Design an enzyme around this catalytic site. Sequence first.
Site, short mmCIF file in Angstrom:
data_model
loop_
_atom_site.label_atom_id
_atom_site.label_comp_id
_atom_site.label_asym_id
_atom_site.label_seq_id
_atom_site.Cartn_x
_atom_site.Cartn_y
_atom_site.Cartn_z
N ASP A 133 -0.29 -36.20 34.15
CA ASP A 133 0.95 -36.05 34.91
C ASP A 133 1.20 -34.58 35.22
OD1 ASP A 133 4.01 -35.41 34.98
OD2 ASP A 133 3.91 -37.56 35.40
N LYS A 189 0.38 -44.98 42.20
CA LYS A 189 1.73 -44.46 42.11
C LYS A 189 2.41 -44.66 43.46
CE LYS A 189 4.06 -40.82 39.56
NZ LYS A 189 3.89 -39.55 38.79
N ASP A 202 4.61 -28.71 31.07
CA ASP A 202 5.06 -29.94 30.42
C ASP A 202 3.95 -30.61 29.63
OD1 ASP A 202 6.86 -31.89 29.70
OD2 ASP A 202 6.74 -33.00 31.58
N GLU A 244 -7.56 -42.21 39.18
CA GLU A 244 -8.43 -42.75 38.15
C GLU A 244 -7.63 -43.62 37.17
OE1 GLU A 244 -10.06 -39.58 35.90
OE2 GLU A 244 -11.48 -40.80 34.75
N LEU A 245 -8.08 -44.85 36.93
CA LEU A 245 -7.39 -45.71 35.97
C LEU A 245 -7.87 -45.41 34.56
CD1 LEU A 245 -5.48 -48.10 35.53
CD2 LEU A 245 -7.45 -49.61 35.63
N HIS A 269 6.09 -48.97 35.28
CA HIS A 269 6.68 -48.10 36.29
C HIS A 269 7.76 -47.19 35.70
CE1 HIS A 269 6.56 -52.49 37.18
NE2 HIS A 269 5.50 -52.12 37.87
N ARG A 323 3.04 -37.68 25.99
CA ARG A 323 3.44 -38.65 27.03
C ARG A 323 2.74 -38.38 28.36
NH1 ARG A 323 7.59 -35.17 26.12
NH2 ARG A 323 8.04 -33.70 27.83
N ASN A 324 2.21 -37.17 28.54
CA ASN A 324 1.58 -36.81 29.80
C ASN A 324 0.06 -36.80 29.72
OD1 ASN A 324 4.04 -36.52 31.18
ND2 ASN A 324 4.28 -34.40 30.45
#
Length: 295
Positions: free
Chosen positions: A170, A50, A149, A97-98, A31, A153-154
């Site tokens: 993201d 989320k 962005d 979507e996982l 999280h 990380r995204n």
Amino acid sequence: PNYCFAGKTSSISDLKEVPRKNITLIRGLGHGAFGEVYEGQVSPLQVAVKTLPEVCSEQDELDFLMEALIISKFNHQNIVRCIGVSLQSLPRFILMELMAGGDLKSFLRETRPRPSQPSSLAMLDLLHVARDIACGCQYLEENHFIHRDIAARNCLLTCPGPGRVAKIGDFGMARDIYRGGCAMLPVKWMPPEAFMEGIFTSKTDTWSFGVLLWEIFSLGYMPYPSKSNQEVLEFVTSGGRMDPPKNCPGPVYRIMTQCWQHQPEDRPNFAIILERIEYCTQDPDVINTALPIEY
Ligand SMILES: Cc1nc([C@](C)(O)CO)sc1-c1cnc(N)c(O[C@H](C)c2cc(F)ccc2N2NC=CN2)c1
């Protein structure tokens, strides 16, 4: 609160509400700062969930709704899918979507070739990740959506192994702008005109993509090693650019340096970037290059 994308407007009423009884949480996924994220299931469909914390501002509520709308209107194989939402129960959920491979920066760091697993990753795996994300960026650019962005990380991966597909996962920065502070800005991913003039265009993402490329081929290093945000801002505005990642083939580095052209008009669009990445996958001297094996 409405959202416009492509040639259509959408409303919260357009979101596919999933009955809360059908949603089971399985485990936390680390999280983030705001909002928890869980691996979960919908009665079975595998999802990332989320959450909006029930203790939040009215503005938090709106940002969350906006995020739901933005993600749900995208339709592209390299943008994470939105399975639906659950806004009618608290805490509110967005269902995605996982992506079982997790985020790209963790994947690169955890999958770096080592003497125990010297074969873990090859140059071609890196180029495919680059291609996947560039394909997602091309879809965004041709729909006049500016991400703002783009960064490792995204990005997310469908699975850890060979069949992996990378997707943009993201959209928090674009969301904030549709609806903050210096120390929160992704300075190390931004071109001069963005952090100077606050001007954003599809050429803004090009610059960030170049930086993403460096993240990928460095195998998950933080950009501009040893430099802080301000130092980077001055380095870059003065014409300074990162060196090639270790063992990086010249043709790949040339893509980065073209993405980091000072003037936006001199930077490639994502159609060109894709062609150049594809040419790289075809060049035996590129893909036969060995990645560093960290000890
Ligand atoms: C299964 C899985 N494992 C992950 C780890 C723990 O970061 C390791 O790669 S992310 C992940 C994972 C898999 N699929 C998702 N749809 C997802 O979405 C969340 C909202 C997310 C999307 C992004 F684009 C970037 C970061 C995050 N996170 N990650 C943690 C909180 N928000 C995370």
